[PDB]
């Protein structure tokens, strides 16, 4: 089926994302519909990328949780701009999001951290994410010891652990097609004869595949 | 099962990639084992990312084909550094590759271009990839007209279409595990007590998850 401007669910790309995300979640052949690739880079243009989970989305943007002292956390703190890719192979769909990133409030991060299974909370205390470690037994040992320490106790959120929110400035909706002639509808914040008004300060236009 | 330094297939990370890639290809639950996310960025640190197919790999690096006048092609030409992510959900594995990018020789690009189905060759001539276009009918029309033009003829490769090779400087092998305590073995080109010699100029070390 065609992916067409006149059959979008919404000209607010966050609501269009919600529509596609719901379809992904309802597809039995998709495991984690909220898996996404996060691209970051140094201020002088050395890029990096890794898989993350989306952990909430709405008008203020796309939220995710990590260690601020990891390789991505140092890049985001020095250069607060990122890009996201969602790829849903069984739907032949891709969503791209570009925007600036801010840290979430500490009390929000505390709340999310304590909502996680206790084993994941202890894992976050164990791991100085992306630091060099000697072997896997080092993690297994420290993890077992922290299980003793936190028996019947609350696990404190590490000072270095928290969340980010990416405020969308660009959102591309890609629908795959034959002959490599895909449908691309791209929203950007802001008129040319091929540029169209969406909701709020959004504009949208079609890009060649 | 543990992902362990003493049970790597190879201390040449390109051969370790080959081993994991073969397992991905042999997994019926993986559609395109060669799908990867490419992260690029401007010289002043504005990142971008999108799905691509890997189209060959070996000692000289990881090859892929695109339009040099696309958004990624302008970034790569201005700032010849990229990052790749392979994510194989059914194997709980991720591979990350960082390195500089060069353009492939024109005669190599010609050969690869003419190996593609004719409909994909014509699609590449139709599409000024990532340029703004008016509607999807614009592509359908131009594509049908180029089918007439190239009936029984060779489709010339566009001057703007070709390939890149990413020479690996960093390669991370990520194997997912319980409690978010994953196995990360990271090769980099080059000794600390946690740094180990691989093949050639490679070093490897374990990173905290
Ligand atoms: C599907 C998937 C989901 C992941 N989700 C997260 C996550 O939400 N946060 C996180 O810190 N790492 C997550 N990881 C691990 C990252 O890919 C990465 O190993 C880690 O964040 C360190 O990246 P860095 O060294 O670039 O900072 C996930 C990995 C996979 C494969
Ligand atoms: C699984 C998958 C594979 C793709 N493979 C390629 C490819 O090899 N080359 C390419 O130019 N675009 C490919 N695309 C399209 C890109 O995601 C993207 O739309 C296009 O390259 C333009 O990106 P840019 O605007 O950042 O330059 C693929 C898309 C998907 C979903
Ligand atoms: C637009 C575009 N160009 C090029 C490629 C490279 O793949 P192939 O040469 O098999 O068409 C792809 C892959 O899906 C693509 O979508
Ligand atoms: C290391 C790591 N931290 C954090 C997360 C975020 O997910 P959750 O809060 O559900 O553990 C993940 C997701 O897989 C992860 O691998
Ligand atoms: Na649905
Ligand atoms: Na195999």
């Amino acid at each position: 089926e065609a992916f067409e401007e006149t059959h979008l669910t919404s000209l607010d790309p966050v609501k269009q994302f919600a529509a596609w995300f719901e379809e992904a979640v309802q597809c039995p052949d998709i495991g984690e519909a909220n898996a996404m690739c996060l691209a970051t880079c140094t201020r002088d243009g050395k890029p990096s990328a890794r898989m993350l989970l989306l952990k909430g989305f709405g008008k203020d943007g796309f939220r995710f949780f990590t260690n601020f002292e990891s390789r991505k956390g140092k890049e985001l703190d020095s250069n607060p701009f990122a890009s996201l890719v969602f790829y849903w192979e069984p739907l032949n769909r891709q969503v791209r999001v570009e925007g600036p990133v801010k840290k979430l409030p500490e009390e929000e991060a505390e709340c999310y951290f304590h909502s996680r299974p206790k084993s994941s909370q202890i894992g976050a205390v164990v791991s100085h994410q992306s630091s060099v470690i000697p072997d896997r037994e080092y993690l297994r040992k420290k993890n077992e010891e922290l299980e003793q320490l936190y028996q019947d106790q609350e696990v404190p959120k590490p000072k270095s652990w928290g969340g980010y929110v990416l405020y969308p400035q660009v959102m591309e909706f890609w629908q795959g097609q034959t002959n490599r002639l895909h449908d691309r509808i791209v929203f950007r914040r802001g008129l040319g004869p091929m540029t169209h008004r969406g909701e709020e300060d959004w504009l949208y236009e079609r890009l060649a595949p």
Side-chain angles (χ1 to χ4, degrees), chain A:
Chain A
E1 293 82 12
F3 176 49
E4 329 183 76
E5 300 92 334
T6 50
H7 302 129
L8 282 156
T9 304
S10 178
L11 301 188
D12 175 348
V14 175
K15 298 184 172 161
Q16 178 64 35
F17 172 84
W20 277 17
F21 180 72
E22 179 183 14
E23 288 190 67
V25 167
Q26 283 300 345
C27 179
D29 303 311
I30 295 173
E32 295 193 296
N34 62 147
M36 65 188 185
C37 190
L38 171 75
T40 63
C41 60
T42 71
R43 250 286 346 170
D44 74 326
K46 292 301 190 300
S48 63
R50 76 291 291 162
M51 299 305 299
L52 241 51
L53 293 187
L54 181 72
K55 291 292 186 173
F57 64 91
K59 191 73 79 89
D60 307 326
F62 293 83
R63 313 188 293 267
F64 56 90
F65 293 87
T66 197
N67 190 320
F68 302 146
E69 288 171 12
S70 66
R71 183 273 191 74
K72 83 191 76 61
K74 290 174 168 179
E75 292 187 1
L76 288 166
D77 289 4
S78 68
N79 185 46
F81 301 94
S83 202
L84 302 176
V85 177
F86 299 83
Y87 178 45
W88 302 306
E89 177 277 344
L91 290 166
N92 205 188
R93 290 173 183 174
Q94 169 183 214
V95 176
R96 302 154 59 164
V97 184
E98 299 164 24
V101 172
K102 303 183 317 194
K103 236 168 244 194
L104 285 176
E106 275 289 341
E107 25 286 308
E108 195 176 336
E110 286 276 357
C111 277
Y112 177 68
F113 182 85
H114 293 311
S115 81
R116 297 175 83 216
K118 184 163 176 190
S119 61
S120 306
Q121 298 174 50
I122 292 175
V125 177
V126 156
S127 183
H128 300 274
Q129 176 180 68
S130 307
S131 300
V132 172
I133 56 158
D135 48 51
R136 70 197 312 275
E137 266 290 303
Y138 179 93
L139 295 167
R140 196 273 303 160
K141 281 165 174 182
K142 308 303 199 96
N143 181 78
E144 217 98 278
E145 294 164 352
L146 290 178
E147 286 174 347
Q148 298 195 37
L149 175 68
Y150 296 128
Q151 194 75 266
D152 294 321
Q153 293 185 27
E154 198 161 74
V155 185
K157 186 189 69 66
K159 279 156 313 93
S160 56
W161 196 93
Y164 290 101
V165 52
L166 186 163
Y167 179 78
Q169 305 279 47
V170 182
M171 293 179 73
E172 175 174 329
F173 299 88
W174 182 104
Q175 172 80 68
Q177 297 292 345
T178 58
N179 294 175
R180 299 314 186 197
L181 290 178
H182 319 298
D183 290 308
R184 305 180 62 185
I185 301 164
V186 190
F187 294 77
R188 57 179 178 88
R189 288 199 202 261
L191 223 62
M194 302 187 285
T195 306
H196 305 283
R197 212 161 246 109
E199 289 202 22
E200 308 166 275
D201 60 342
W202 291 107
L203 301 176
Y204 68 89
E205 56 219 349
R206 180 180 284 277
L207 302 189

